[PDB]
Backbone:
């Protein structure tokens, strides 16, 4: 028999209740602007799918970020545009300002309202306890928002969090792997960066949901409170599940496999072995103990579960005692 079907615990049917045109990005008609409205100033970065530049809008002299898309399926480009348009104005979501083509090359580009190219990866191994809680809460605002809008990011990692530490402002960027959640849809498991991949991706369980982002968030949290980058340090996608199994234990892994009737790749048969579930105290030492509290460990434990349905939702996470002082200070301000 096949894998047991799965549904999101929250925001299950939000796209069903929308007009077709909200989520049917293949049918979306883009009005392409003129990249000659922008002059590129300098290169910020370069991923697999894009080169990113600081630029000037010559019309209003405003600084913007231009993301030149490396050639790719028209389908992926419409998906990213539609998701960015749907989420525009959401808390801690990057703002799409324009969609343009170079008049000569006809290469498509996305124009975003300016953010500094200071990613969380550059800052997140040097934060105070309070600032980890503060920025984690800001990321949760973006995730609860996109999940509530029927979208999963699928590439949550420190590089995709841009932070202005001076102004205590955060933006979740790079929506190029994001998808719409539809109940019963089987998704591509070749998403996310190795160290942040949820167990569903690693065992090829395709009927996943928003909870994938909550695993990635747990990987980030573990890295930061333990000063261990990355927390799960696999050599490849097979060894990645072994690194998880040595922490979360094999009993819960095989119970998860059984629960969803997952057909485990035979490569796993000799490498997973037999491992106890480790107490988090095992990762605490003199250099990180100031970042680790009962609150932090209780919260982390409820993000890093094999069973995607078990993980906290973004809103449940925001309700956790770990954030009580952040929530109190926000109200005060
Ligand atoms: Br690097 C970098 C900086 C700002 C934005 Br907005 C980005 N989007 N993708 N990569 C980005
Ligand atoms: Br990095 C970064 C993040 C969020 C905001 Br809002 C920013 N404004 N300038 N630079 C920013
Ligand atoms: Cl990263
Ligand atoms: Na401590």
Residues:
């Amino acid at each position: 028999s096949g894998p047991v079907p799965s549904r999101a615990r929250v925001y299950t049917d939000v796209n069903t209740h929308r007009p077709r045109e909200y989520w049917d990005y293949e049918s979306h008609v883009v009005e392409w602007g003129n990249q000659d409205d922008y002059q590129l100033v300098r290169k910020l970065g370069r991923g697999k799918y894009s080169e990113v530049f600081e630029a000037i809008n010559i019309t209003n002299n405003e600084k913007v970020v231009v993301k030149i898309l490396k050639p790719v399926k028209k389908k992926k480009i419409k998906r990213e545009i539609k998701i960015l348009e749907n989420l525009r104005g959401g808390p801690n979501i990057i703002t799409l300002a324009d969609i343009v083509k170079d008049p000569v090359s006809r290469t498509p580009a996305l124009v975003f309202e300016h953010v500094n190219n200071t990613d969380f990866k550059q800052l997140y191994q040097t934060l105070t306890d309070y600032d980890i809680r503060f920025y984690m809460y800001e990321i949760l605002k973006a995730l609860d928002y996109c999940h509530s809008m029927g979208i999963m990011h699928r590439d949550v990692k420190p590089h995709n969090v841009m932070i202005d530490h001076e102004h205590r402002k955060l933006r979740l960027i790079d929506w190029g792997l994001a998808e719409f959640y539809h109940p019963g849809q089987e998704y591509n498991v070749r998403v996310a960066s190795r160290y942040f991949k949820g167990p569903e991706l690693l065992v090829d369980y395709q009927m996943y949901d928003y909870s994938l982002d909550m695993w990635s968030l747990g990987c980030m949290l573990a890295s930061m409170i333990f000063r261990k980058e990355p927390f799960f340090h696999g050599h490849d996608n097979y060894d990645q599940l072994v690194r998880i199994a040595k922490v979360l234990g094999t009993e819960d892994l095989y119970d998860y496999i059984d629960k969803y009737n997952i057909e485990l790749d035979p490569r796993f048969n000799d490498i997973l072995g037999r491992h106890s579930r480790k107490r988090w105290e095992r990762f605490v030492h003199s250099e990180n103990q100031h970042l680790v509290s009962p609150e932090a460990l209780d919260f982390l434990d409820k993000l890093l579960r094999y069973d995607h349905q078990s993980r906290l939702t973004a809103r449940e996470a925001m309700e956790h005692p770990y954030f009580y002082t952040v929530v109190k200070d926000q109200a005060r301000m």
Summary: The beta strands are 33-34, 38-46, 50-57, 62-69, 96-101, 108-113, 151-152, 161-164, 169-172, 179-180. The chain has eleven helices and ten strands.
